[PDB]
Nucleic acid binder design. Structure first.
Ligand SMILES: NC(=O)c1ccc[n+]([C@@H]2C[C@H](COP(=O)(O)OP(=O)(O)OC[C@H]3O[C@@H](n4cnc5c(N)ncnc54)[C@H](O)[C@@H]3O)[C@@H](O)[C@H]2O)c1
Length: 209
DNA sequence: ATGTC
């Protein structure tokens, strides 16, 4: 019988530690189309233009790159591309943070969001704006440690939670890191912003490859 | 096993 979703429902954004100062200085994650002051790109360039044109067919609309993106799992396929040095970025997974919030925190804050049931660039992805539709997602595929096949699982593992334009830092509940050295560098950075929320910093090696 | 498609 099919796994239900966790409540609260965690959402996960991976970023390079060299971006954490910018996030704290702005007080928010910014969508790609808001030109975040990032220091490090961990993306594939060749899938960027698809996200700049992929229309979001739920209000508030626009395109995928109008939204701050999250997965419903850690240890994403995107992280595997980074871990394996397939990206232009060659720093590997160790400096990649998982920033963790929940879908309910976003709804409670009244921020406009949408979410998908699969990788968002796919033309057959479904989009939702009601948290009751989390039932439409495949929680087995989202939680799978082996995702490369079959193809439906690979697609559904990459269901996304999308928050329009910006995501306030105060909604982050945990920063998860690969190593004790990265956790210590994260706390150093949080201490430079003594008025910012300070989420717990947890080493979760099992969220990495 | 997995190099986001
Ligand atoms: N990052 C994720 O967890 C995630 C989740 C779901 C989908 N995706 C998509 C996969 C693909 C590559 O991802 P990503 O590299 O995140 O996207 P991107 O290529 O749009 O890069 C935006 C970068 O800016 C960073 N950032 C945002 N706000 C700030 C700020 N205020 N100061 C400094 N840096 C900031 C953000 O963390 C990310 O590293 C994009 O198309 C994403 O939309 C990513």
């Amino acid at each position: 019988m099919k796994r239900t979703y966790p409540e609260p429902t965690p959402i996960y954004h991976i970023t390079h530690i060299d971006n954490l100062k910018g996030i704290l200085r702005m007080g928010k994650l910014l969508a790609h189309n808001q030109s975040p002051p990032k220091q490090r790109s961990i993306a594939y360039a060749h899938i960027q233009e698809r996200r700049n044109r992929a229309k979001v067919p739920q209000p508030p609309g626009g395109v995928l790159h109008d939204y701050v993106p999250f997965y419903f799992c850690p240890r994403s396929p995107m992280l595997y591309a980074i871990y394996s040095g397939a990206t232009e970025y060659q720093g590997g997974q160790e400096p990649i943070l998982h920033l963790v919030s929940s879908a309910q925190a976003v709804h409670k804050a009244g921020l406009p969001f949408v979410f998908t049931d699969r990788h968002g660039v796919l033309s057959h992805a479904r989009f939702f704006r009601q948290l009751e539709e989390l039932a439409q997602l495949d929680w087995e595929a989202i939680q799978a440690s082996y995702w490369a096949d079959p193809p439906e699982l690979r697609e559904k593992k990459q269901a996304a939670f999308l928050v329009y334009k910006a995501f306030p830092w105060a909604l982050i509940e945990e920063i998860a890191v690969y190593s004790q050295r990265v956790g210590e560098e994260v706390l150093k950075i949080l201490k430079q912003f003594p008025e910012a929320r300070r989420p717990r910093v947890c080493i979760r090696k099992d969220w990495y490859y």
